[PDB]
Structure formats: structure tokens, C-alpha cells
């Protein structure tokens, strides 16, 4: 029927389904501003990671390939993940990108941080170690795994792809909910 989903509907297969993957696997940008409203404006994010199924696997990839400092913005979120402090700094990042356009080189980057509350000295520590460094890596051999060349972007055990433009919504209010209903009738396949 039309309430059921369908492949090319709502979502399609990865021609090469990663195996091995987290169960839902968010790539975004803060550079990318259907980004900014899924985690800032329109709670799209927040609906999925609060409706998923008790203990469902999650992660969230940010992407190099857009922005001047793409990899550079890719090194902060795995900071951000580091120290916990990804909450704190989000909206932040967001809005020095997007809005001010005020992040243009990695000091402005650090000085985000830092002006949100985080330690600076943690940051410090945590930007060229090896835990950083190892998210880095995660998060870019994710994006040539999953052949992700557009965000937001999500994916569900390694095999099926969300589509942005193929959710039955009419409000953002059902977008959100449809959205996540979506991705959790994909985890149950």
C-alpha cells in the first residue's frame, strides 16, 4: 500500500553493504545546512536517536568533502566526541559556519570550543591523539565505505539508505516522525 515502504521510495540499497557496521550510521557536515535544521531546527536527529530500539547501535560521521575546512571540521566533531562536549559545541559550530561565517582557520576552530566552555587544555591534549585520530580515520573510511557523496545522509545496518526527498510528511512535525519510523521498520529487516 502506500503506507508501506518500498525500495526507491523511501530508501534504497547500498549496491555494496558495508558489513560489520553500526546499526545507524548519520553522516553529516557543518558546513551542509539541511544539517544545520535536522540537528538544530527541526529535531530530525533527536527524533531518530530517541525512537530507535532500546540499545540500537549509533554513530554519527561528520564528512571532509565539503568547506574549505571540511577535514578540519571532521578532526573538531571527533574532538567533540572525545571530550563529550558534542552538545555543547554544536550549536556553536553551526551557527561560526553557517551563520557568522566566522571559522575560517583552525584557531577559530579551537576559540569555539573554548568560548562554548570547554577546557582548553583538553582540547589541546585530545586534537592530535590517538583516539582523535582513530574517530578520523572511522569517520572518513565510512564515507568511501558507504559511498556517501552527498549529506545528511544516513544509513541503516550497512545496507539500506535513507531518502531525504522520499518521506510522506506534510508538516515537519510528521517529517521528523516519519523519518524515524522509516529507519526503524529498515532496522527490523
Given amino acids: 500500500?502506500?503506507?508501506?515502504?518500498?525500495?526507491?521510495k523511501?530508501?534504497?540499497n547500498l549496491s555494496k553493504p558495508v558489513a560489520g557496521a553500526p546499526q545507524v550510521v548519520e553522516f553529516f557536515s557543518f558546513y551542509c545546512p539541511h544539517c544545520?535544521?535536522?540537528?538544530?531546527?527541526?529535531?530530525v536527529n533527536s527524533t531518530v536517536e530517541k525512537n530507535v530500539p532500546e540499545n540500537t547501535k549509533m554513530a554519527r560521521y561528520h564528512?571532509?568533502?565539503l568547506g574549505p575546512l571540511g577535514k578540519e571540521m571532521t578532526r573538531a566533531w571527533a574532538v567533540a566526541i572525545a571530550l563529550g562536549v558534542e552538545d555543547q559545541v554544536s550549536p556553536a559550530l553551526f551557527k561560526g559556519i553557517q551563520e557568522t561565517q566566522s571559522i575560517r582557520s583552525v584557531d577559530d576552530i579551537?576559540?569555539?570550543?573554548?568560548?562554548?566552555?570547554?577546557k582548553a587544555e583538553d582540547y589541546?591534549?585530545?586534537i592530535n591523539s590517538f583516539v582523535v585520530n582513530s574517530l578520523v580515520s572511522q569517520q572518513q573510511n565510512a564515507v568511501t565505505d558507504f559511498q556517501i557523496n552527498g549529506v545528511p545522509a544516513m544509513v541503516i545496518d550497512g545496507k539500506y539508505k535513507m531518502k531525504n526527498d522520499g518521506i510522506s510528511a506534510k508538516s515537519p512535525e510528521e517529517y521528523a516522525k516519519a523519518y524515524s519510523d522509516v529507519v526503524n521498520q529498515l532496522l527490523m529487516k
Fill in 124 to 126: 589541546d591534549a585530545a
Fill in 110 to 118: 579551537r576559540t569555539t570550543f573554548i568560548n562554548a566552555g570547554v
Fill in 63 to 65: 564528512v571532509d568533502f
Fill in 36 to 43: 544545520y535544521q535536522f540537528s538544530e531546527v527541526y529535531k
Fill in 10 to 12: 523511501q530508501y534504497t
Fill in 1 to 8: 500500500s502506500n503506507a508501506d515502504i518500498s525500495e526507491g
